[PDB]
Design a protein around this motif. Structure first.
Motif, PDB file in Angstrom:
ATOM      1  N   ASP A 122      12.581  19.652   6.182  1.00 55.60           N
ATOM      2  CA  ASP A 122      12.161  19.709   7.578  1.00 55.60           C
ATOM      3  C   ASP A 122      11.153  20.820   7.838  1.00 55.60           C
ATOM      4  O   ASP A 122      10.372  20.733   8.791  1.00 55.60           O
ATOM      5  CB  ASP A 122      13.383  19.895   8.475  1.00 55.60           C
ATOM      6  N   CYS A 123      11.157  21.868   7.020  1.00 49.71           N
ATOM      7  CA  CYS A 123      10.327  23.037   7.249  1.00 49.71           C
ATOM      8  C   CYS A 123       9.582  23.406   5.978  1.00 49.71           C
ATOM      9  O   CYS A 123      10.099  23.257   4.869  1.00 49.71           O
ATOM     10  CB  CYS A 123      11.166  24.246   7.698  1.00 49.71           C
ATOM     11  N   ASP A 124       8.360  23.895   6.160  1.00 51.48           N
ATOM     12  CA  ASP A 124       7.673  24.637   5.116  1.00 51.48           C
ATOM     13  C   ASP A 124       7.946  26.129   5.230  1.00 51.48           C
ATOM     14  O   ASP A 124       8.063  26.818   4.211  1.00 51.48           O
ATOM     15  CB  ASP A 124       6.162  24.386   5.190  1.00 51.48           C
ATOM     16  N   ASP A 125       8.076  26.618   6.458  1.00 55.14           N
ATOM     17  CA  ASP A 125       8.250  28.030   6.773  1.00 55.14           C
ATOM     18  C   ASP A 125       9.667  28.229   7.290  1.00 55.14           C
ATOM     19  O   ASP A 125      10.020  27.702   8.348  1.00 55.14           O
ATOM     20  CB  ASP A 125       7.223  28.457   7.823  1.00 55.14           C
ATOM     21  N   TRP A 126      10.472  28.993   6.557  1.00 54.38           N
ATOM     22  CA  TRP A 126      11.887  29.147   6.870  1.00 54.38           C
ATOM     23  C   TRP A 126      12.192  30.397   7.692  1.00 54.38           C
ATOM     24  O   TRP A 126      13.358  30.642   8.012  1.00 54.38           O
ATOM     25  CB  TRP A 126      12.694  29.138   5.572  1.00 54.38           C
ATOM     26  N   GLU A 127      11.175  31.206   7.980  1.00 55.97           N
ATOM     27  CA  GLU A 127      11.076  32.235   9.020  1.00 55.97           C
ATOM     28  C   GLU A 127      11.838  33.537   8.789  1.00 55.97           C
ATOM     29  O   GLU A 127      11.380  34.587   9.248  1.00 55.97           O
ATOM     30  CB  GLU A 127      11.542  31.647  10.355  1.00 55.97           C
ATOM     31  N   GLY A 157      15.436  35.408   6.251  1.00 52.43           N
ATOM     32  CA  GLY A 157      16.624  35.185   5.450  1.00 52.43           C
ATOM     33  C   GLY A 157      17.775  34.640   6.269  1.00 52.43           C
ATOM     34  O   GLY A 157      18.493  33.742   5.825  1.00 52.43           O
ATOM     35  N   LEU A 158      17.970  35.175   7.476  1.00 50.69           N
ATOM     36  CA  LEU A 158      19.042  34.679   8.327  1.00 50.69           C
ATOM     37  C   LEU A 158      18.799  33.230   8.728  1.00 50.69           C
ATOM     38  O   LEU A 158      19.726  32.415   8.714  1.00 50.69           O
ATOM     39  CB  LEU A 158      19.187  35.562   9.568  1.00 50.69           C
ATOM     40  N   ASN A 159      17.563  32.887   9.096  1.00 48.99           N
ATOM     41  CA  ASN A 159      17.301  31.509   9.493  1.00 48.99           C
ATOM     42  C   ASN A 159      17.514  30.551   8.332  1.00 48.99           C
ATOM     43  O   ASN A 159      18.050  29.454   8.513  1.00 48.99           O
ATOM     44  CB  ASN A 159      15.885  31.354  10.032  1.00 48.99           C
ATOM     45  N   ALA A 160      17.086  30.941   7.131  1.00 50.40           N
ATOM     46  CA  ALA A 160      17.304  30.080   5.977  1.00 50.40           C
ATOM     47  C   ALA A 160      18.788  29.923   5.689  1.00 50.40           C
ATOM     48  O   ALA A 160      19.238  28.840   5.313  1.00 50.40           O
ATOM     49  CB  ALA A 160      16.569  30.628   4.753  1.00 50.40           C
ATOM     50  N   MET A 161      19.562  30.998   5.840  1.00 51.11           N
ATOM     51  CA  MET A 161      20.993  30.884   5.584  1.00 51.11           C
ATOM     52  C   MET A 161      21.650  29.970   6.610  1.00 51.11           C
ATOM     53  O   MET A 161      22.546  29.192   6.278  1.00 51.11           O
ATOM     54  CB  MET A 161      21.647  32.263   5.612  1.00 51.11           C
ATOM     55  N   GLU A 162      21.222  30.067   7.867  1.00 51.91           N
ATOM     56  CA  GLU A 162      21.765  29.193   8.901  1.00 51.91           C
ATOM     57  C   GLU A 162      21.396  27.738   8.639  1.00 51.91           C
ATOM     58  O   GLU A 162      22.219  26.834   8.835  1.00 51.91           O
ATOM     59  CB  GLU A 162      21.256  29.649  10.265  1.00 51.91           C
ATOM     60  N   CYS A 163      20.164  27.496   8.188  1.00 50.77           N
ATOM     61  CA  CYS A 163      19.770  26.135   7.843  1.00 50.77           C
ATOM     62  C   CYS A 163      20.566  25.617   6.657  1.00 50.77           C
ATOM     63  O   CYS A 163      20.934  24.440   6.617  1.00 50.77           O
ATOM     64  CB  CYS A 163      18.272  26.082   7.550  1.00 50.77           C
ATOM     65  N   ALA A 164      20.818  26.479   5.668  1.00 52.16           N
ATOM     66  CA  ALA A 164      21.630  26.081   4.524  1.00 52.16           C
ATOM     67  C   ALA A 164      23.046  25.737   4.956  1.00 52.16           C
ATOM     68  O   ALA A 164      23.640  24.782   4.458  1.00 52.16           O
ATOM     69  CB  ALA A 164      21.652  27.198   3.480  1.00 52.16           C
ATOM     70  N   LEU A 165      23.609  26.527   5.866  1.00 52.23           N
ATOM     71  CA  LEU A 165      24.943  26.232   6.376  1.00 52.23           C
ATOM     72  C   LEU A 165      24.973  24.880   7.077  1.00 52.23           C
ATOM     73  O   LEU A 165      25.875  24.065   6.852  1.00 52.23           O
ATOM     74  CB  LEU A 165      25.374  27.348   7.322  1.00 52.23           C
ATOM     75  N   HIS A 166      23.972  24.617   7.920  1.00 50.14           N
ATOM     76  CA  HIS A 166      23.901  23.325   8.596  1.00 50.14           C
ATOM     77  C   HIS A 166      23.784  22.187   7.586  1.00 50.14           C
ATOM     78  O   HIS A 166      24.447  21.150   7.714  1.00 50.14           O
ATOM     79  CB  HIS A 166      22.717  23.321   9.566  1.00 50.14           C
ATOM     80  N   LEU A 205       5.077  20.781   0.546  1.00 47.74           N
ATOM     81  CA  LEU A 205       5.790  19.751  -0.185  1.00 47.74           C
ATOM     82  C   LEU A 205       5.624  18.407   0.508  1.00 47.74           C
ATOM     83  O   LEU A 205       5.420  18.333   1.718  1.00 47.74           O
ATOM     84  CB  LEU A 205       7.269  20.115  -0.303  1.00 47.74           C
ATOM     85  N   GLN A 206       5.687  17.341  -0.282  1.00 51.40           N
ATOM     86  CA  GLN A 206       5.621  15.988   0.243  1.00 51.40           C
ATOM     87  C   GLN A 206       6.810  15.205  -0.287  1.00 51.40           C
ATOM     88  O   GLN A 206       7.510  15.651  -1.194  1.00 51.40           O
ATOM     89  CB  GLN A 206       4.297  15.304  -0.134  1.00 51.40           C
ATOM     90  N   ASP A 207       7.034  14.025   0.289  1.00 46.08           N
ATOM     91  CA  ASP A 207       8.076  13.147  -0.229  1.00 46.08           C
ATOM     92  C   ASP A 207       7.876  12.914  -1.719  1.00 46.08           C
ATOM     93  O   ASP A 207       6.748  12.816  -2.200  1.00 46.08           O
ATOM     94  CB  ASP A 207       8.059  11.787   0.475  1.00 46.08           C
ATOM     95  N   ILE A 208       8.978  12.820  -2.450  1.00 48.95           N
ATOM     96  CA  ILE A 208       8.934  12.418  -3.849  1.00 48.95           C
ATOM     97  C   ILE A 208       9.226  10.927  -3.876  1.00 48.95           C
ATOM     98  O   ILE A 208      10.340  10.498  -3.571  1.00 48.95           O
ATOM     99  CB  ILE A 208       9.936  13.199  -4.710  1.00 48.95           C
ATOM    100  N   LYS A 209       8.222  10.132  -4.225  1.00 43.89           N
ATOM    101  CA  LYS A 209       8.385   8.690  -4.176  1.00 43.89           C
ATOM    102  C   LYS A 209       9.343   8.228  -5.266  1.00 43.89           C
ATOM    103  O   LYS A 209       9.451   8.834  -6.331  1.00 43.89           O
ATOM    104  CB  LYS A 209       7.033   7.994  -4.328  1.00 43.89           C
ATOM    105  N   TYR A 257      16.010  19.568  -2.997  1.00 46.65           N
ATOM    106  CA  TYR A 257      14.621  19.780  -2.593  1.00 46.65           C
ATOM    107  C   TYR A 257      14.513  20.813  -1.470  1.00 46.65           C
ATOM    108  O   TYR A 257      13.610  21.662  -1.479  1.00 46.65           O
ATOM    109  CB  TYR A 257      14.024  18.440  -2.158  1.00 46.65           C
ATOM    110  N   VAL A 258      15.414  20.740  -0.486  1.00 44.11           N
ATOM    111  CA  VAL A 258      15.428  21.729   0.594  1.00 44.11           C
ATOM    112  C   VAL A 258      15.610  23.131   0.026  1.00 44.11           C
ATOM    113  O   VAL A 258      14.923  24.081   0.419  1.00 44.11           O
ATOM    114  CB  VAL A 258      16.536  21.408   1.610  1.00 44.11           C
TER     115      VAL A 258
END
Ligand code: NA
Ligand code: NA
Ligand code: NA
Ligand code: NA
Ligand code: NA
Ligand code: NA
Ligand code: NA
Ligand code: NA
Ligand code: NA
Ligand code: NA
Ligand code: NA
Ligand code: NA
Ligand code: NA
Ligand code: NA
Ligand code: NA
Ligand code: NA
Ligand code: NA
Ligand code: NA
Ligand code: NA
Ligand SMILES: [Zn+2]
Ligand SMILES: [Zn+2]
Ligand SMILES: [Zn+2]
Ligand SMILES: [Zn+2]
Ligand SMILES: [Zn+2]
Ligand SMILES: [Zn+2]
Ligand SMILES: [Zn+2]
Ligand SMILES: [Zn+2]
Ligand SMILES: [Zn+2]
Ligand SMILES: [Zn+2]
Ligand SMILES: [Zn+2]
Ligand SMILES: [Zn+2]
Ligand SMILES: [Zn+2]
Ligand SMILES: [Zn+2]
Ligand SMILES: [Zn+2]
Ligand SMILES: [Zn+2]
Ligand SMILES: [Zn+2]
Ligand SMILES: [Zn+2]
Ligand SMILES: [Zn+2]
Ligand SMILES: [Zn+2]
Ligand SMILES: [Zn+2]
Ligand SMILES: [Zn+2]
Ligand SMILES: [Zn+2]
Ligand SMILES: [Zn+2]
Ligand SMILES: [Zn+2]
Ligand SMILES: [Zn+2]
Ligand SMILES: [Zn+2]
Ligand SMILES: [Zn+2]
Ligand SMILES: [Zn+2]
Ligand SMILES: [Zn+2]
Ligand SMILES: [Zn+2]
Ligand SMILES: [Zn+2]
Ligand SMILES: [Zn+2]
Ligand SMILES: [Zn+2]
Ligand SMILES: [Zn+2]
Ligand SMILES: [Zn+2]
Ligand SMILES: [Zn+2]
Ligand SMILES: [Zn+2]
Ligand SMILES: [Zn+2]
Ligand SMILES: [Zn+2]
Ligand SMILES: [Zn+2]
Ligand SMILES: [Zn+2]
Ligand SMILES: [Zn+2]
Ligand SMILES: [Zn+2]
Ligand SMILES: [Zn+2]
Ligand SMILES: [Zn+2]
Ligand SMILES: [Zn+2]
Ligand SMILES: [Zn+2]
Ligand SMILES: [Zn+2]
Ligand SMILES: [Zn+2]
Ligand SMILES: [Zn+2]
Ligand SMILES: [Zn+2]
Ligand SMILES: [Zn+2]
Ligand SMILES: [Zn+2]
Ligand SMILES: [Zn+2]
Ligand SMILES: [Zn+2]
Ligand SMILES: [Zn+2]
Ligand SMILES: [Zn+2]
Ligand SMILES: [Zn+2]
Ligand SMILES: [Zn+2]
Ligand SMILES: [Zn+2]
Ligand SMILES: [Zn+2]
Ligand SMILES: [Zn+2]
Lengths: 172, 172, 172, 172, 172, 172
Positions: B85-90, B92-101, D78-82, B28-29
């Motif tokens: 956790d986010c709708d806005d991933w800000e 490409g670098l931030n999204a890649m860092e979030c994916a790594l985490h 996006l919202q939780d998927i129940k 989902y993320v």
């Protein structure tokens, strides 16, 4: 004496053994560089591929000298392969400059080998060096010089974009 | 008890159900990230493609765990899939860092799962985790680390040219 | 610390660097053997081919360990590659026996590495060793043992006909 | 406001986000059903295959709505998927009846969405719903109704032979 | 001691010999079942084919263990293969239930073997068991459980029509 | 009585069951020999291949007798398969001599079976034995006799070179 040995001076045999060690050392240096660029904090895969290919080529150069040594009835005497001067090669431009310095050192050794073969009137060994090593060295030096020139002109090492694009467009 | 169940601890069954939920959450993320890069004001189609592929892969990971649960005679118990956790991933670098985490969090969960399987002397489950999940996680983490390194070195996120060229040349 | 490093103990990193050196050393030993059998006064070309192939395989083993080291966020530290114990390998049977001894030494090192990885609860490293190294070592040891058995039963090293026919029919 | 947004009402944007969540929920329900029929004590592999295919199709429906949301300049939230209502779906006939109820609920939501798009004079959104969702829903409802009819007439759920033969001959 | 033997405990060698006998016994049981279903008064040819294939597979399992025993330098010691518990297997459902019981017994023996290999710190043997035997056993147990479930739900053994149709549609 | 049984004497049925056990025993003997030659201290891979093929052939002989037993309405009664007389077969020549002795024993049993079938006026069973077993036995005995003759004339077992070359040139 070997039953095949003819016109093969002991000094030439020793110099061939030294050249074998130098080619194996160069292969090791290139292996070290290749896996430096495979680090997650460097991450330039085409630099890594380029230097791995160079490492395999230097191994082939060494094996061709060993084959020559046996063809002429000399005896191979192996020595330790010293570890490369650096673990951290610092940038694509720095590694290319180190490779250029290494290739010029190998070329100087090959020129001294050719001079020795001429001095001992060994035309087969002279021709072997000319045919298999001298133009290969000149081509390698010219290619590395071109790479250094392009990396410097694009702004490396201070521009990481420069090394990224060089990795993609020249080494890819 | 299931007619097939053998050497399958209830704690292992519960941990597999938790891992299923974690893989679905990761899917989902990645879906959220993919469609962030599909926005007209972001417009990086190869970032979008990359994260959509990751989302589909995580869905497959979850389905393989569900298949395992049934193979061993455990019972699948599904839970809500929490929104990312986010709708806005800000960027490409931030999204890649979030994916790594995220991938490191999933890897930690898998390592705890492997420790539990070892503690319960379940070698089939240990082998399942090792064969299908552990090296996949290490490879994914290494790839994301490489992407982060390259984006940082090219000047992202402040250089939109950096993310554009990375989208074209690495993710294209 | 590397951005990718997770569950990778410093002791494991050091042990992987030692294993890299051991595989490179084994490659060098096999190279020495190969060109011993290329000598005009030995002249067993399929023994030479066999050991050259082993040398290339050991180089690949070392490179796979270097790739692993980078994947896990460890840092490769190279050391000198010591010269092999012998220049003169004395016979096909003696070289095969030396190869068997070498492969058993490498296998012992790999078993100590696996024990260390188990002790540090590193299942990815344990699986890496099991999947890529342990059965390869068992197969290599079994093949070398078979070669030694056959050479001994045919009358080697005292029968040069034995080594000639073994070179033709088993290694050809 | 998005640079592409034109004739796209905020109410329509919210309704599309609700529909995205509904399609993801339906995908999850079908995933749950699929792996119910994969249980060793249920063991109807073509029921499992049928519902897994439905789950993947619903995921595609959701992704097409997300693409639409971005095309029109709306923002995906996006919202939780129940989790689904059941872990145990009790029989092939019961699962088919639940699927029929679910598809009729999704169809009702789509009809309300179309009514909203008409009320806001959004012909592009009306056409999108008609072209990609309405006939698909009618076809799915008709197919599920046919399956329920056949299973009931063959004697399901009390006849396990009925569900076995339906699994083989209709879903196989 | 064998020239190849390394890290191979005598207890492991004995346990491998016991496992060889168990696999040969299982092959014999499946052979008996296969030709029970070939009787003119039973006449279920796809049950016969299924169990004959299982018999051949168990023979292969035994041969792979013998190959392992030789690879590690252990010595194979064969024992009598005891006759199966039944001449008359009474029905397709009863034979499937007996096969399930047999496969779970073999799986238990393999789990004890893996525990012994872990206790003796033999990672090659642990990996051998995991890679070639454990998931095969889990898959076989799951398949047999599915067959038993379907036969029971169709009305076997009291419905000969059930076993006939299962023979045609699942085993055909 | 079986609905298919006709002109099938109980003594013939018992003799067929004894022959089934003898063929299974021969298969086991050949399996033992095959893996003797797979030992690292024997290491004759084509002897191993030859005897493994013989083992599989004897298994097929047994299965054909079981099929016959069912075709005629007899009932298969299996017995323990006794372990072979030797674990250590000592040499290629000794194993070939043991195989010859075994094949002559099996041939004698088949001749007694044919005599019984003649005495009971069972021409179908007589023809079955003649068509599928008698010439196969004569051919096998002749081939084994040829192998023994050649191994003896080349100097086996005292010449390990003899067994090596026979393994390569006759069995390869
Ligand atoms: Na270095
Ligand atoms: Na220089
Ligand atoms: Na110079
Ligand atoms: Na989100
Ligand atoms: Na993390
Ligand atoms: Na962690
Ligand atoms: Na990777
Ligand atoms: Na040497
Ligand atoms: Na050793
Ligand atoms: Na050891
Ligand atoms: Na559910
Ligand atoms: Na409804
Ligand atoms: Na409605
Ligand atoms: Na039986
Ligand atoms: Na059991
Ligand atoms: Na058990
Ligand atoms: Na035996
Ligand atoms: Na005899
Ligand atoms: Na006789
Ligand atoms: Zn010199
Ligand atoms: Zn690249
Ligand atoms: Zn090379
Ligand atoms: Zn080269
Ligand atoms: Zn060179
Ligand atoms: Zn020579
Ligand atoms: Zn040559
Ligand atoms: Zn020399
Ligand atoms: Zn040397
Ligand atoms: Zn040094
Ligand atoms: Zn748990
Ligand atoms: Zn693009
Ligand atoms: Zn997927
Ligand atoms: Zn996947
Ligand atoms: Zn995953
Ligand atoms: Zn199950
Ligand atoms: Zn399954
Ligand atoms: Zn559960
Ligand atoms: Zn559930
Ligand atoms: Zn939430
Ligand atoms: Zn260490
Ligand atoms: Zn040759
Ligand atoms: Zn190589
Ligand atoms: Zn290799
Ligand atoms: Zn190696
Ligand atoms: Zn790294
Ligand atoms: Zn890598
Ligand atoms: Zn280090
Ligand atoms: Zn280094
Ligand atoms: Zn040294
Ligand atoms: Zn493993
Ligand atoms: Zn010959
Ligand atoms: Zn609304
Ligand atoms: Zn089915
Ligand atoms: Zn899909
Ligand atoms: Zn769809
Ligand atoms: Zn839908
Ligand atoms: Zn947009
Ligand atoms: Zn679009
Ligand atoms: Zn919105
Ligand atoms: Zn969102
Ligand atoms: Zn819920
Ligand atoms: Zn034991
Ligand atoms: Zn049939
Ligand atoms: Zn088989
Ligand atoms: Zn098998
Ligand atoms: Zn088995
Ligand atoms: Zn052995
Ligand atoms: Zn083997
Ligand atoms: Zn033993
Ligand atoms: Zn034995
Ligand atoms: Zn018995
Ligand atoms: Zn009789
Ligand atoms: Zn052979
Ligand atoms: Zn067979
Ligand atoms: Zn046969
Ligand atoms: Zn036979
Ligand atoms: Zn019959
Ligand atoms: Zn028949
Ligand atoms: Zn009988
Ligand atoms: Zn029986
Ligand atoms: Zn016995
Ligand atoms: Zn006839």
């Amino acid at each position: 004496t070997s039953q095949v040995r003819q016109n093969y001076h002991q000094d030439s045999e020793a110099a061939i053994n030294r050249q074998i060690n130098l080619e194996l050392y160069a292969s090791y240096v290139y292996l070290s560089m290749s896996y430096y660029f495979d680090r997650d904090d460097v991450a330039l895969k085409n630099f890594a591929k380029y230097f791995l290919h160079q490492s395999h080529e230097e191994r082939e150069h060494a094996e061709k000298l060993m084959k020559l040594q046996n063809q002429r009835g000399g005896r191979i005497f192996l020595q330790d392969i010293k570890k490369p001067d650096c673990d951290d090669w610092e940038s694509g431009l720095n590694a290319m400059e180190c490779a250029l310095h290494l290739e010029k050192n190998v070329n100087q050794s090959l020129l001294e080998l050719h001079k020795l073969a001429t001095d001992k009137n060994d035309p087969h060994l002279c021709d072997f060096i000319e045919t298999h090593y001298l133009n290969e060295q000149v081509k390698a030096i010219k290619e590395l010089g071109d790479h250094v020139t392009n990396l410097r002109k694009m702004g490396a090492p201070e521009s990481g974009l420069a090394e990224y694009l060089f990795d993609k467009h020249t080494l890819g």
